[PDB]
Amino acid sequence: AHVVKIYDTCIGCTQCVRACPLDVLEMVPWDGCKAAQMASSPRTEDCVGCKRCETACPTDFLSVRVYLGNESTRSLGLAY
Amino acid sequence: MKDFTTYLSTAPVVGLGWAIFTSGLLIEINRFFPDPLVFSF
Amino acid sequence: MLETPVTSAPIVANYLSNLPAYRTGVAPNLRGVEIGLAHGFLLAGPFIKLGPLRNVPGAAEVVGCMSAAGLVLILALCLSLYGNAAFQSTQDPLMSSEGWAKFAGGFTVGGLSGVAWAYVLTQV
Amino acid sequence: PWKQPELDPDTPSPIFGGSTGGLLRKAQVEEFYVTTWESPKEQIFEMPTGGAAIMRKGPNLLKFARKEQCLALTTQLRTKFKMTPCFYRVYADGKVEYLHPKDGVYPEKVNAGRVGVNQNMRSIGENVDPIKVKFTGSQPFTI
Amino acid sequence: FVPPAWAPSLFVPLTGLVLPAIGMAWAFTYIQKEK
Amino acid sequence: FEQWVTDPIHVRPIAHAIWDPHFGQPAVEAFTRGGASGPVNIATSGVYQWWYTIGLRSNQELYVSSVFLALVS
Amino acid sequence: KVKIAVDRNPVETNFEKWAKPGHFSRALAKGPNTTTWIWNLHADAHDFDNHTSDLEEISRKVFSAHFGQLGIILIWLSGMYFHGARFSNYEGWLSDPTHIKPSAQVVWPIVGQEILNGDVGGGFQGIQITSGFFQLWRASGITSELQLYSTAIGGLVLAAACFFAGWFHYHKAAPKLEWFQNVESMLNHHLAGLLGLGSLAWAGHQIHVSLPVNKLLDAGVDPKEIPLPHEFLLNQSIIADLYPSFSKGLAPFFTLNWAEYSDFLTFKGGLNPVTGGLWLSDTAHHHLAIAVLFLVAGHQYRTNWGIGHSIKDILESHKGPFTGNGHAGLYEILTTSWHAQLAINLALFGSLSIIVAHHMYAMPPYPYLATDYGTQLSLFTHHMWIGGFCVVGAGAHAAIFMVRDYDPTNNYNNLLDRVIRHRDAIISHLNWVSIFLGFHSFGLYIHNDTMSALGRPQDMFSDTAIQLQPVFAQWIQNTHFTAPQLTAPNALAATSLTWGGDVVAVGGKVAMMPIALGTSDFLVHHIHAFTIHVTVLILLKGVLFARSSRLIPDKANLGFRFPCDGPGRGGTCQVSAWDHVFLGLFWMYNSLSIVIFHFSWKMQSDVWGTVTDSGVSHITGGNFAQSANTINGWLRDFLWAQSSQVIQSYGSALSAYGLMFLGAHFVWAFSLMFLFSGRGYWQELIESIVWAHNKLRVAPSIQPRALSITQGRAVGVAHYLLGGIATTWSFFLARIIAVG
Amino acid sequence: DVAGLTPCSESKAYNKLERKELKTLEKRLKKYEPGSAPYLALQATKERTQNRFKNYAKAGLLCGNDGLPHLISDPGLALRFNHAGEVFIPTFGFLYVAGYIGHVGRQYIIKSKEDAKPTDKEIILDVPLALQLAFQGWAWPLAAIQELRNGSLLEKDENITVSPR
Ligand code: CLA
Ligand code: CLA
Ligand code: CLA
Ligand code: CLA
Ligand SMILES: CC1=C(/C=C/C(C)=C/C=C/C(C)=C\C=C\C=C(C)\C=C\C=C(C)\C=C\C2=C(C)CCCC2(C)C)C(C)(C)CCC1
Ligand SMILES: CC1=C(C/C=C(\C)CCC[C@H](C)CCC[C@H](C)CCCC(C)C)C(=O)c2ccccc2C1=O
Ligand code: SF4
């Protein structure tokens, strides 16, 4: 499926997870940010690449990136 | 007055004023100098 | 899921039950023969009517019959292609690969038989 | 959460008529998703696959063909009535997978029990150029 | 040397009907070829 | 090619003959141009002028050139 | 129960909010920082549902906006009457309407545009107008320019009154929500007062003013020697001489002997041979009957006096077994949602505009209207396009209601819920119908073109080879030709000349004549039905899938107007209902363009022309029976055979039509860069221009940004529609003025 | 007599075009009585056409083979054949006016940035300040080249927003 990569510039604001319509991201404990939270993608096989997480990222550039490629039944959003 | 003046100070109103000013200037120039093409004093 | 009066009508249910495709009471060869007969008989219709030789009497029916036979053969080739390229991997024998091959053979046999029957009916 | 709940197919479905955008043949060929919630009272909600339904006072079970529909229903129930539902995924062979509350605390929380995966530890824009990774099968963002 | 007069009556239907038909048949079997 | 070689001003070059069973009789009659026995297409690629310029004159030369280029391919 | 509920002075008339451009929404209240704010200023200006969540303030804003639009309309009408009063040859046109072209716009000689003031006749120079205002004023009994001046001054006064009324009813005395929700009182007052009372007043004007002036004009007397309408109003001797039944003096009306009024309230259905228009007595009895029917219908609903009908009770009572809750929650929907009422009003208004265009080309309800071919063509095309725009806005605002104002609590098993519940079957069946129609019409056209290019005229679907005649339309035409014979024996002749009969001509030009229907007419009618079906499919798919879909289950949370949901699931570009309306606008444009092309060609070939002693010689010689069956026929015998007047109009008064034609081609071509492409390219180009202006230290404080994807689509569809509309307008007007 | 072209006064097609225009104007004029406003309008149009045709001649304008005057754009060639007033002087005048516009816009951009919310001044224009900068732009090239000399016209590449490579 698609590739979801999260960098260290994330501030743990949990906006990307709330904007996710397929429950791909998660919040794990961290020490590199003030909020002590870091975004993770343990369910990247269910991500369709809608880039809704990138819209909700408040940091400049993007702390979360979605790269398309190798579309599957789950990645193409097919009910059939 | 000053609220109406700031409304007149908005960009579309002053653009409209420039539009009427420039159009009237060019139209009066064309009317009182009928169809010129080459600058010949 | 959304049931309708026309889809769940008992008359519609028994009309679709005894159809050759949904009978599930015979070999695929007989169903293919019936399908080919019916569809060739109806497909010969527009060919004996509006073909390029429709103004010429006699030859119009023959030309339409060979065109219907060619269309039947093309449909049989596409049926065989679908059977070979659809059921190539793992209770109805029609959904099987060789079952669909026998269905296609019955379909082309019925198609040529229906074309010949339409030719006989147009001649008489 | 502490113990992963097991789905019950005998739980009553919410009061609804017939759906057209419901489960297709993929439900009997591939996996399909099933959402469960616990309604304290009967009320009308809007399904993502059609019109409106009425949930029963008790357990409620619904079936969908896409995980996005399940999460849309979940977030609608959480925003409108604070329902906290949960959906499973059932394959063709009957394998049941727990999907939304992986630790039972929802992904908005942390719970100090999830290991962060697929996290690049370098800043964005510090990735190597595609010329550096050529004829290797490794993307610049996958390292 | 010079082709016969029936060559347009044979090669044109061959490359207009038969050859594209067998090409599409081969391509259809190649698209849906599974393991 | 030979008729165009003899008179390069008046008669038009022929690209390829047309064999279309969907053609009607007025369409067959209207496409008979350049002194041909059937429906032909008037050549606009300019290979007639080029092959006249390089020295090709007979149809046998074009035949052997075509078979040699097929062998080369 | 029904009473006036008005709040006194809720909004103070202060200019403090005129200084701040963005004030209606909190998003724009923070001030501008990018240029996309400015477009957002001009996009959410009338989005009153987004500014406030209170329905009362939205209703007050709607009332004020309607008053403003009526004031604008009255200003435009007063300006039209003023232009007819001063810069017009209406008095010259009244002397000889069959030789002087109607002109009401005069240009200033500045840069050589004075050549646009063509020789319209009657010692006047101006632009030949196609609005038909001259025929409307002749139908209203207007003779001198003083009456037009008085009408213009009254229109300006009423426009100022309506503008002050909007200011008063918003700022001073704002009606409450309960005042707007009295739908029964609104319907009763509109049926009885807005429509019926106006119909009776216009009927009385036609009886007392328009009929004698029109009769004297048809008699051939001097318009200057025609007595003034007040002489007919006060003194009864002239009205008794013109109509003996006026000598009774309202006796037959109050003694129920209405047959005595048959001299000036006639039923002679057809065209007046003197002027080629509808009989004014027929229009008088028509508007009188319409007024009576609407005053009857306006006493239907119960408001405050017990008797009447309840709309909610009627809607809840009409429930069948196959529909569940039949029309249950619709009363609450239409009394709370402005957008549902907007969709209903726009759909019915557009359909009625199409009806107006059809029944106005069919029956010209104006003296010397059918002789002016340009006026009839322009009016038909204009009403056609306004109707199409209204019926596509109906789908747009229906989708807006679906996104915003739909409540699933009030819609459990009602009709809207079941429509949403089988929307997939609806869309699939409509798609199949559209595909089948497009095949069996456009493929028929391609078949005709191929068999024409293959030299097989006997293989074509023409009027000579394969007779696919419209037997139903021909049977209906024959039945309506015999409508006065057996089923409506009180009518003197047929209700229109399109069904059949003879040829009515005015001044040597044919006003109306029977229209023959052949295979080409059947082909173009089925093509029109196919295009309408496709547009209906697009707009219905936009409306029904506005909330959710299999592709996107949470489309309602994304709003009505969003560009996309990213490239996920393969790509979700143009998935919103707004994008569906944007796509359907082009299909509406294509449908109406084909419709008006069919109208222009059919009426130029089989209706319009000149009348000589040998017969009726049409403009194009009746090629529609042999050329309209192929696409190349429209390409050559309709688009290339015509449009020669547009390209040869240079150096004459019609050259502005050619310039407008070129500009319309330009705008249509310029729209394609917004229709195609995207946003990131222009954003990076703007970044490069930002670097260029930053090098020179002339970078603006407001950051320039590329247009939004929705904004870019809107700009593209707007410029595309404007270019196509003005192209057809210029081509039609130039062709119909030069040769007509 | 450059580019193989003849002067408009010496040309025959120019006089033929003028005669054709006068003929069609007279044909339009003959349909109206002399005591009517369209007659005076057409007489004024004919007088304007005659004045324009006289002014195009005896002014250095030349036409080739169609009577439509042609313009010479190369400086020097236009200088030695008195064709500088065709495009050479108007292009300098347009450059002067365009520099006026650019200098006025630059002055308004710079002078409205050292204050709170410069976008508010951008969207609601300071009309007295705009008019003052309008009447102070008559010496735009002097101020432009002086800003070039002192380096305030151009920004350095360190304070300029730049796209990643
Ligand atoms: C029989 C009485 C009557 C009449 C004639 C009208 C007439 C009208 N109403 Mg109204 N309405 C009425 C009663 C009436 N209303 C009642 C009782 C209610 C409350 C239930 C409403 C609630 C209502 C709403 C909510 C809206 C209208 C609107 C309109 C306009 C529709 C647009 C149109 O057709 O243009 C026709 C235009 C003309 C004929 C031009 C002349 C218009 C004149 C000035 C109006 C004169 C009639 C007026 C009602 C007399 C009373 C006002 C008096 C105190 C001065 C029209 C002017 C719409 C609107 O706001 O438009 C401004 C609108 O949205 N009506
Ligand atoms: C709205 C439409 C309309 C209008 C305005 C009129 C108006 C008129 N018609 Mg017409 N008519 C109409 C429709 C109309 N009719 C229709 C539908 C038909 C059916 C075919 C006719 C058939 C018809 C015939 C056959 C005749 C008329 C005639 C008349 C006139 C007689 C009026 C009369 O006695 O009525 C009754 C009028 C009143 C009772 C007056 C109203 C009460 C007043 C206004 C009270 C004022 C009080 C006020 C406070 C005090 C003054 C104020 C001041 C001090 C400042 C009048 C000009 C007759 C005519 O022209 O001869 C004179 C005639 O022969 N009409
Ligand atoms: C009965 C009339 C009516 C009414 C009262 C409304 C009211 C509304 N509509 Mg609707 N609409 C209508 C007809 C109507 N519409 C029709 C006929 C169409 C189809 C064309 C639409 C299509 C439509 C869409 C697609 C949308 C709306 C929206 C809206 C809302 C805000 C509109 C706004 O802010 O525009 C502000 C004004 C403008 C943006 C100016 C528009 C100017 C156009 C694009 C170009 C004008 C060209 C002009 C004719 C020629 C210019 C030439 C040039 C050289 C000068 C509001 C609820 C919007 C919304 O959010 O709904 C809630 C929305 O998305 N409407
Ligand atoms: C002339 C160009 C053209 C054509 C042919 C189509 C064709 C189609 N569009 Mg459309 N469309 C076009 C331009 C065109 N579009 C443009 C410019 C836009 C932008 C506004 C759109 C926007 C648009 C939308 C928004 C929708 C469509 C839809 C459709 C379908 C309707 C099917 C139908 O009724 O006709 C049947 C098809 C034809 C008549 C095609 C003509 C070709 C011949 C006659 C068919 C046979 C060819 C030949 C004999 C077979 C060759 C075999 C082999 C050699 C290849 C169809 C696929 C709708 C859809 O999906 O289906 C309902 C739909 O919703 N289109
Ligand atoms: C003589 C002549 C000619 C020629 C010319 C030429 C050849 C030119 C060149 C030129 C060049 C070769 C140039 C260059 C340049 C460069 C640069 C680098 C620039 C810059 C600029 C700037 C920077 C500007 C600025 C400004 C603005 C924009 C605004 C404000 C003001 C100012 C001015 C400051 C011709 C024939 C055509 C025509 C006639 C005349
Ligand atoms: C060109 C283009 C742009 C760039 C267009 C922009 C930035 C809009 C520019 C509008 C200008 C500023 C309007 C005013 C133009 C003139 C300066 C005003 C008239 C001047 C005369 C009176 C002198 C997009 O942003 C875009 C977005 C989405 C899809 C397609 C496109 C698209 O095609
Ligand atoms: S939206 Fe961005 S900054 Fe916020 S938690 Fe997600 S990756 Fe981090």
PDB file of N, CA, C and O in Angstrom, chain C residues 65-98:
ATOM      1  N   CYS C  65     -28.219 -14.233 -42.673  1.00  0.00           N
ATOM      2  CA  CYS C  65     -28.002 -15.485 -41.956  1.00  0.00           C
ATOM      3  C   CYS C  65     -26.517 -15.765 -41.752  1.00  0.00           C
ATOM      4  O   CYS C  65     -26.109 -16.189 -40.663  1.00  0.00           O
ATOM      5  N   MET C  66     -25.688 -15.533 -42.777  1.00  0.00           N
ATOM      6  CA  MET C  66     -24.247 -15.696 -42.571  1.00  0.00           C
ATOM      7  C   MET C  66     -23.684 -14.647 -41.619  1.00  0.00           C
ATOM      8  O   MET C  66     -22.760 -14.948 -40.856  1.00  0.00           O
ATOM      9  N   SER C  67     -24.224 -13.425 -41.632  1.00  0.00           N
ATOM     10  CA  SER C  67     -23.777 -12.421 -40.668  1.00  0.00           C
ATOM     11  C   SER C  67     -24.159 -12.810 -39.244  1.00  0.00           C
ATOM     12  O   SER C  67     -23.373 -12.617 -38.308  1.00  0.00           O
ATOM     13  N   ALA C  68     -25.361 -13.366 -39.064  1.00  0.00           N
ATOM     14  CA  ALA C  68     -25.770 -13.854 -37.751  1.00  0.00           C
ATOM     15  C   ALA C  68     -24.909 -15.027 -37.303  1.00  0.00           C
ATOM     16  O   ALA C  68     -24.569 -15.135 -36.120  1.00  0.00           O
ATOM     17  N   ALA C  69     -24.549 -15.914 -38.234  1.00  0.00           N
ATOM     18  CA  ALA C  69     -23.657 -17.023 -37.902  1.00  0.00           C
ATOM     19  C   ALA C  69     -22.275 -16.525 -37.496  1.00  0.00           C
ATOM     20  O   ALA C  69     -21.667 -17.053 -36.559  1.00  0.00           O
ATOM     21  N   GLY C  70     -21.764 -15.508 -38.193  1.00  0.00           N
ATOM     22  CA  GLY C  70     -20.488 -14.925 -37.811  1.00  0.00           C
ATOM     23  C   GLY C  70     -20.532 -14.250 -36.452  1.00  0.00           C
ATOM     24  O   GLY C  70     -19.588 -14.362 -35.663  1.00  0.00           O
ATOM     25  N   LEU C  71     -21.628 -13.546 -36.160  1.00  0.00           N
ATOM     26  CA  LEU C  71     -21.792 -12.938 -34.841  1.00  0.00           C
ATOM     27  C   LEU C  71     -21.890 -14.003 -33.754  1.00  0.00           C
ATOM     28  O   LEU C  71     -21.352 -13.831 -32.654  1.00  0.00           O
ATOM     29  N   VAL C  72     -22.574 -15.111 -34.051  1.00  0.00           N
ATOM     30  CA  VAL C  72     -22.666 -16.228 -33.113  1.00  0.00           C
ATOM     31  C   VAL C  72     -21.287 -16.827 -32.859  1.00  0.00           C
ATOM     32  O   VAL C  72     -20.934 -17.142 -31.717  1.00  0.00           O
ATOM     33  N   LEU C  73     -20.484 -16.982 -33.916  1.00  0.00           N
ATOM     34  CA  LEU C  73     -19.133 -17.513 -33.758  1.00  0.00           C
ATOM     35  C   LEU C  73     -18.250 -16.566 -32.948  1.00  0.00           C
ATOM     36  O   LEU C  73     -17.440 -17.016 -32.129  1.00  0.00           O
ATOM     37  N   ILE C  74     -18.391 -15.255 -33.164  1.00  0.00           N
ATOM     38  CA  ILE C  74     -17.630 -14.277 -32.386  1.00  0.00           C
ATOM     39  C   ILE C  74     -18.035 -14.332 -30.915  1.00  0.00           C
ATOM     40  O   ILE C  74     -17.183 -14.291 -30.015  1.00  0.00           O
ATOM     41  N   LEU C  75     -19.340 -14.443 -30.650  1.00  0.00           N
ATOM     42  CA  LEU C  75     -19.818 -14.561 -29.276  1.00  0.00           C
ATOM     43  C   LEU C  75     -19.337 -15.857 -28.632  1.00  0.00           C
ATOM     44  O   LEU C  75     -19.025 -15.885 -27.438  1.00  0.00           O
ATOM     45  N   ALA C  76     -19.270 -16.941 -29.407  1.00  0.00           N
ATOM     46  CA  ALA C  76     -18.751 -18.199 -28.884  1.00  0.00           C
ATOM     47  C   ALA C  76     -17.265 -18.095 -28.561  1.00  0.00           C
ATOM     48  O   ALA C  76     -16.802 -18.646 -27.555  1.00  0.00           O
ATOM     49  N   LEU C  77     -16.505 -17.404 -29.415  1.00  0.00           N
ATOM     50  CA  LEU C  77     -15.085 -17.190 -29.146  1.00  0.00           C
ATOM     51  C   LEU C  77     -14.884 -16.366 -27.881  1.00  0.00           C
ATOM     52  O   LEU C  77     -14.016 -16.682 -27.058  1.00  0.00           O
ATOM     53  N   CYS C  78     -15.686 -15.314 -27.701  1.00  0.00           N
ATOM     54  CA  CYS C  78     -15.581 -14.508 -26.488  1.00  0.00           C
ATOM     55  C   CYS C  78     -16.025 -15.288 -25.254  1.00  0.00           C
ATOM     56  O   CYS C  78     -15.447 -15.115 -24.175  1.00  0.00           O
ATOM     57  N   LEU C  79     -17.032 -16.154 -25.397  1.00  0.00           N
ATOM     58  CA  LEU C  79     -17.451 -17.020 -24.298  1.00  0.00           C
ATOM     59  C   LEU C  79     -16.344 -17.984 -23.893  1.00  0.00           C
ATOM     60  O   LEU C  79     -16.084 -18.181 -22.699  1.00  0.00           O
ATOM     61  N   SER C  80     -15.680 -18.594 -24.879  1.00  0.00           N
ATOM     62  CA  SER C  80     -14.570 -19.496 -24.586  1.00  0.00           C
ATOM     63  C   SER C  80     -13.403 -18.750 -23.951  1.00  0.00           C
ATOM     64  O   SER C  80     -12.749 -19.272 -23.040  1.00  0.00           O
ATOM     65  N   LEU C  81     -13.132 -17.528 -24.420  1.00  0.00           N
ATOM     66  CA  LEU C  81     -12.079 -16.714 -23.822  1.00  0.00           C
ATOM     67  C   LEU C  81     -12.396 -16.375 -22.371  1.00  0.00           C
ATOM     68  O   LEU C  81     -11.516 -16.446 -21.504  1.00  0.00           O
ATOM     69  N   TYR C  82     -13.651 -16.012 -22.090  1.00  0.00           N
ATOM     70  CA  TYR C  82     -14.050 -15.708 -20.719  1.00  0.00           C
ATOM     71  C   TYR C  82     -13.954 -16.941 -19.829  1.00  0.00           C
ATOM     72  O   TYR C  82     -13.522 -16.848 -18.675  1.00  0.00           O
ATOM     73  N   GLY C  83     -14.352 -18.104 -20.350  1.00  0.00           N
ATOM     74  CA  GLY C  83     -14.247 -19.325 -19.570  1.00  0.00           C
ATOM     75  C   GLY C  83     -12.811 -19.725 -19.286  1.00  0.00           C
ATOM     76  O   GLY C  83     -12.497 -20.200 -18.191  1.00  0.00           O
ATOM     77  N   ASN C  84     -11.925 -19.539 -20.264  1.00  0.00           N
ATOM     78  CA  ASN C  84     -10.523 -19.883 -20.057  1.00  0.00           C
ATOM     79  C   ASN C  84      -9.823 -18.893 -19.134  1.00  0.00           C
ATOM     80  O   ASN C  84      -8.948 -19.287 -18.357  1.00  0.00           O
ATOM     81  N   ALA C  85     -10.190 -17.614 -19.199  1.00  0.00           N
ATOM     82  CA  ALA C  85      -9.500 -16.574 -18.449  1.00  0.00           C
ATOM     83  C   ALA C  85     -10.211 -16.179 -17.161  1.00  0.00           C
ATOM     84  O   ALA C  85      -9.752 -15.259 -16.478  1.00  0.00           O
ATOM     85  N   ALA C  86     -11.311 -16.841 -16.809  1.00  0.00           N
ATOM     86  CA  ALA C  86     -12.059 -16.509 -15.603  1.00  0.00           C
ATOM     87  C   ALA C  86     -11.993 -17.596 -14.541  1.00  0.00           C
ATOM     88  O   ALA C  86     -11.741 -17.302 -13.370  1.00  0.00           O
ATOM     89  N   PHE C  87     -12.215 -18.855 -14.921  1.00  0.00           N
ATOM     90  CA  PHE C  87     -12.243 -19.966 -13.979  1.00  0.00           C
ATOM     91  C   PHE C  87     -10.968 -20.798 -14.027  1.00  0.00           C
ATOM     92  O   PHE C  87     -11.016 -22.019 -13.846  1.00  0.00           O
ATOM     93  N   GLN C  88      -9.823 -20.159 -14.265  1.00  0.00           N
ATOM     94  CA  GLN C  88      -8.552 -20.865 -14.339  1.00  0.00           C
ATOM     95  C   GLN C  88      -7.993 -21.231 -12.971  1.00  0.00           C
ATOM     96  O   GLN C  88      -6.992 -21.952 -12.905  1.00  0.00           O
ATOM     97  N   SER C  89      -8.604 -20.759 -11.890  1.00  0.00           N
ATOM     98  CA  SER C  89      -8.155 -21.040 -10.536  1.00  0.00           C
ATOM     99  C   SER C  89      -9.298 -21.629  -9.720  1.00  0.00           C
ATOM    100  O   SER C  89     -10.464 -21.598 -10.122  1.00  0.00           O
ATOM    101  N   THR C  90      -8.957 -22.169  -8.547  1.00  0.00           N
ATOM    102  CA  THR C  90      -9.993 -22.763  -7.660  1.00  0.00           C
ATOM    103  C   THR C  90     -11.075 -21.716  -7.372  1.00  0.00           C
ATOM    104  O   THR C  90     -10.698 -20.631  -6.886  1.00  0.00           O
ATOM    105  N   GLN C  91     -21.150 -25.464  -6.096  1.00  0.00           N
ATOM    106  CA  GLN C  91     -21.634 -26.777  -6.501  1.00  0.00           C
ATOM    107  C   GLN C  91     -22.186 -26.742  -7.922  1.00  0.00           C
ATOM    108  O   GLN C  91     -22.454 -27.784  -8.521  1.00  0.00           O
ATOM    109  N   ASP C  92     -22.353 -25.540  -8.456  1.00  0.00           N
ATOM    110  CA  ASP C  92     -22.859 -25.385  -9.813  1.00  0.00           C
ATOM    111  C   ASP C  92     -21.766 -25.729 -10.817  1.00  0.00           C
ATOM    112  O   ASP C  92     -20.686 -25.124 -10.773  1.00  0.00           O
ATOM    113  N   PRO C  93     -21.991 -26.683 -11.727  1.00  0.00           N
ATOM    114  CA  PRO C  93     -20.963 -27.002 -12.731  1.00  0.00           C
ATOM    115  C   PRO C  93     -20.770 -25.919 -13.778  1.00  0.00           C
ATOM    116  O   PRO C  93     -19.763 -25.960 -14.499  1.00  0.00           O
ATOM    117  N   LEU C  94     -21.700 -24.968 -13.897  1.00  0.00           N
ATOM    118  CA  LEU C  94     -21.547 -23.892 -14.872  1.00  0.00           C
ATOM    119  C   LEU C  94     -20.388 -22.973 -14.514  1.00  0.00           C
ATOM    120  O   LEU C  94     -19.662 -22.506 -15.397  1.00  0.00           O
ATOM    121  N   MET C  95     -20.189 -22.712 -13.219  1.00  0.00           N
ATOM    122  CA  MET C  95     -19.111 -21.835 -12.779  1.00  0.00           C
ATOM    123  C   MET C  95     -17.732 -22.468 -12.909  1.00  0.00           C
ATOM    124  O   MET C  95     -16.732 -21.771 -12.721  1.00  0.00           O
ATOM    125  N   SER C  96     -17.650 -23.761 -13.214  1.00  0.00           N
ATOM    126  CA  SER C  96     -16.369 -24.418 -13.410  1.00  0.00           C
ATOM    127  C   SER C  96     -15.797 -24.072 -14.784  1.00  0.00           C
ATOM    128  O   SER C  96     -16.467 -23.489 -15.642  1.00  0.00           O
ATOM    129  N   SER C  97     -14.530 -24.439 -14.991  1.00  0.00           N
ATOM    130  CA  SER C  97     -13.846 -24.095 -16.233  1.00  0.00           C
ATOM    131  C   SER C  97     -14.321 -24.965 -17.391  1.00  0.00           C
ATOM    132  O   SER C  97     -14.788 -24.458 -18.419  1.00  0.00           O
ATOM    133  N   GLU C  98     -14.202 -26.290 -17.246  1.00  0.00           N
ATOM    134  CA  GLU C  98     -14.658 -27.186 -18.305  1.00  0.00           C
ATOM    135  C   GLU C  98     -16.175 -27.175 -18.435  1.00  0.00           C
ATOM    136  O   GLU C  98     -16.701 -27.418 -19.528  1.00  0.00           O
TER     137      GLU C  98
END
